[PDB]
């Protein structure tokens, strides 16, 4: 009876959750917050707003939603990629464990979703905001899924440049489009900037792939090699070697990716194969320059001051 | 120019996603489907619909949402618990790897979310459905987080029975309340939430209980290998602390921290629970009392075979 009295009180009430329970499970997340880059993601949202003109308090909420998705996605990504470092610091899952980091990151996806309701009281608009949120998160996971499948089951599938670009459109375009589409839907204020934001996302991803090797060849650890990632330079090298009949090189690239090695000489041998044998580094540098010129040479404002600053710091 | 033309076509279109890409990404999920249990899940939904009377088409989508949430949460739970088996088969992360399984599980969470939108087009009711989905997923994660925290930080915090029960209301109550609450809002007809919470508690304590009991009557008692603060373990820890039985308290802690697969050591912890603290009998009794709260509910305060095959 005292037992049943306690049970009856428990089941007729909401679940008890304290501020202390809250702090305990936020550990994986608080750790990644110490990392910088939040001012650059905020700087993009700000330039875009000069076109969208959302009031500042609404923009603030869009910002928070996007920071949560972004940080949660990096927590998961580092587990998925087995990364030891992120922004010069030890990775959350190595500190608090994969179990807590996975649960916390997923918890934060749902807190971000909860924030959408603070953007309007209008039921029609709300529905659209949630649909955008849902769609681009579906897109993000589809892209990530392919990137991870290709890498983990290599050489089952050797992606082409086309396939790589479609995966980026889902993966990276997912979060870029999500921010921009929420803003365009909230705008109280010409043509959509989705194509432009897609382009920015592609430049962002390929430049990330490139610098990861270029910083190490010349700063960084070419950690993408250790991870075995089918990066833009690797995709070009794998397809170049196949096409030119460089069987031994094609096979050595695969073998090195499959070692998941941290040996600096082995990583440097692969990067020099990309520099002199396949010319994938030059191919990638020029491909990046051509994408950037599609904008810098966009006089007819077909895609489009502060535009450029953003494109040269797109690394942060 | 040919490169520019192709980039322009790419950026002006929706992201390319094919049926084959969908298949690749679904593999870790199709794997756990080969797991029976959908019928007992479906039967609970069917039986409850006799109070709610949702039209079949709507009931089917609620059922699909439930199946996705439950399957995805077990794909992730097995990674979190380093479980090698689920319903006798090899867990997905051991076959497809942890990276792919986490991502697929998460992708299905959002697929489930999308289906919510097909429950109704009425704008107010849609906000309500989404809020129910959002609230119960937050609860599930909160409870899972606390359960993992206690396990991974042991011995920093040893929960009490009360704290254990609040963790369960969040963790196990979440998917139970989520289903019930969705159906109650879609009903074209008292709340059955208290009863579904009670069902959830019985379900989690019985899960914890059978994991040790099935092993002792022959079950691998994986909860011990996992080192989790299950209901009988919580009882045993507080019992020994309270009776000032220091060495038994520490012995229980030492075994859980071993994360051991050794049958003989697992048995040793079960015999501490049987002979020293009498925790297994305390749990059998606790479950029976919760079940009686239902069998002796004559005024129908909670109610408007499932309770016996709830495991
Ligand atoms: O907590 P654990 O790790 O001990 C474990 O229970 C796994 C687990 C982790 C997290 C949540 C859950 C869980 C919560 C809620 C429901 C369920 N499963 S369920 O699919 O049978 C289910 C619950 C409520 C339902 C309500 C109405 C219709 C169908 C329902 C189905 C599982 C289980 P286990 O299988 O690993 O022992
Ligand atoms: Mg990464
Ligand atoms: Mg990655
Ligand atoms: Mg489990
Ligand atoms: Mg678990």
UniProtKB/Swiss-Prot annotation, chain A:
| Entry GO MF terms | (2E,6E)-farnesyl diphosphate synthase activity; dimethylallyltranstransferase activity; geranylgeranyl diphosphate synthase activity; metal ion binding
User: Per the UniProt record, which EC number(s) apply here?
Assistant: 2.5.1.-, 2.5.1.1, 2.5.1.29, 2.5.1.10
Quote the cofactor binding remark. Binds 2 Mg(2+) ions per subunit.
- What compartments host this protein? Cytoplasm
Q: GO CC terms for this protein? A: mitochondrion
Q: In which pathway does it act?
A: Isoprenoid biosynthesis; farnesyl diphosphate biosynthesis; farnesyl diphosphate from geranyl diphosphate and isopentenyl diphosphate: step 1/1; Isoprenoid biosynthesis; geranyl diphosphate biosynthesis; geranyl diphosphate from dimethylallyl diphosphate and isopentenyl diphosphate: step 1/1; Isoprenoid biosynthesis; geranylgeranyl diphosphate biosynthesis; geranylgeranyl diphosphate from farnesyl diphosphate and isopentenyl diphosphate: step 1/1
Record-linked SUPFAM superfamilies: Terpenoid synthases
Catalytic function, reaction form:
isopentenyl diphosphate + dimethylallyl diphosphate = (2E)-geranyl diphosphate + diphosphate; isopentenyl diphosphate + (2E)-geranyl diphosphate = (2E,6E)-farnesyl diphosphate + diphosphate; isopentenyl diphosphate + (2E,6E)-farnesyl diphosphate = (2E,6E,10E)-geranylgeranyl diphosphate + diphosphate
Task: Tell me what effect the entry lists for residue 141 to A.
Answer: Reduced affinity for isopentenyl diphosphate (IPP)
Top-level taxon of the source organism: Eukaryota
Q: Which GO terms describe its biological process?
A: farnesyl diphosphate biosynthetic process; geranyl diphosphate biosynthetic process; geranylgeranyl diphosphate biosynthetic process; isoprenoid biosynthetic process; protein transport; terpenoid biosynthetic process
Q: Where is this site: Important for determining product chain length?
A: 109
Q: What is the effect of changing residue 110 to A?
A: Reduced affinity for isopentenyl diphosphate (IPP)
Q: Which positions does UniProt annotate for isopentenyl diphosphate binding?
A: 38, 41, 70, 87
Pfam family for this entry, one: polyprenyl_synt
Where Mg(2+) 1 is bound, by residue? 77, 81
- Which keywords appear in this protein's UniProt record, sorted alphabetically? Carotenoid biosynthesis, Cytoplasm, Isoprene biosynthesis, Magnesium, Metal-binding, Protein transport, Transferase, Transport
Q: Which consequence is recorded for altering residue 109 to A?
A: Reduced affinity for isopentenyl diphosphate (IPP)
User: Where is dimethylallyl diphosphate bound in this sequence?
Assistant: 86, 171-172, 205, 212, 219, 229
The protein's required cofactor(s) are namely: Mg(2+)
Positions bound to Mg(2+) 2: 77, 81
Main function = Catalyzes the trans-addition of the 3 molecules of IPP onto DMAPP to form geranylgeranyl pyrophosphate. Required for the membrane attachment of YPT1 and SEC4. May be involved in vesicle trafficking and protein sorting.
Give the UniProt family note.
Answer: Belongs to the FPP/GGPP synthase family.
Other comments? Present with 2840 molecules/cell in log phase SD medium.
The name this protein carries in UniProt is Geranylgeranyl pyrophosphate synthase BTS1
Organism annotation:
Saccharomyces cerevisiae (strain ATCC 204508 / S288c) (Baker's yeast)
Gene it is expressed from: BTS1
């Amino acid at each position: 009876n005292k037992m049943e009295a306690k049970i009856d009180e428990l089941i007729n009430n909401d679940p008890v959750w304290s501020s202390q329970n809250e702090s305990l499970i936020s550990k994986p997340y608080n750790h990644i917050l110490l990392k910088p880059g939040k001012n650059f993601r905020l700087n993009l949202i700000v330039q875009i707003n000069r076109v969208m003109n959302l009031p500042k308090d609404q923009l603030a909420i869009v910002s928070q939603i996007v920071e949560l998705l972004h940080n949660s996605s990096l927590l998961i990504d580092d587990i998925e990629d087995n990364a030891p470092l992120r922004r010069g610091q030890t990775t959350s899952h190595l500190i608090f464990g994969v179990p807590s980091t996975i649960n916390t990151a997923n918890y934060m996806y749902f807190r971000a979703m909860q924030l959408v309701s603070q953007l309007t009281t209008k039921e029609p608009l709300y529905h659209n905001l949630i649909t955008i949120f849902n769609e681009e998160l579906i897109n993000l996971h589809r892209g990530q899924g392919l990137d991870i499948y290709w890498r983990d089951f290599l050489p089952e599938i050797i992606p082409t440049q086309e396939m790589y670009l479609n995966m980026v459109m889902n993966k990276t375009g997912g979060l870029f489009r999500l921010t921009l589409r929420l803003m365009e839907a909230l705008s109280p204020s010409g043509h959509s900037l989705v194509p432009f934001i897609n382009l920015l996302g592609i430049i962002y991803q390929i430049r990330d792939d490139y610098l990861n090797l270029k910083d190490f060849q010349m700063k960084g650890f070419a950690e993408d090699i250790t991870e075995g990632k089918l990066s833009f330079p690797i995709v070009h090298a794998l397809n170049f070697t196949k096409t030119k009949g460089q069987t031994e090189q094609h096979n050595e690239i695969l073998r090195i990716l499959l070692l998941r090695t941290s040996d600096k000489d082995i990583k440097l041998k692969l990067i020099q194969i990309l520099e002199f044998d396949t010319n994938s580094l030059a191919y990638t540098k020029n491909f990046i320059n051509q994408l950037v010129n599609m904008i810098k040479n966009d006089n007819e404002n077909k895609y489009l001051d502060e535009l450029l600053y953003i494109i040269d710091h797109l690394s942060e």
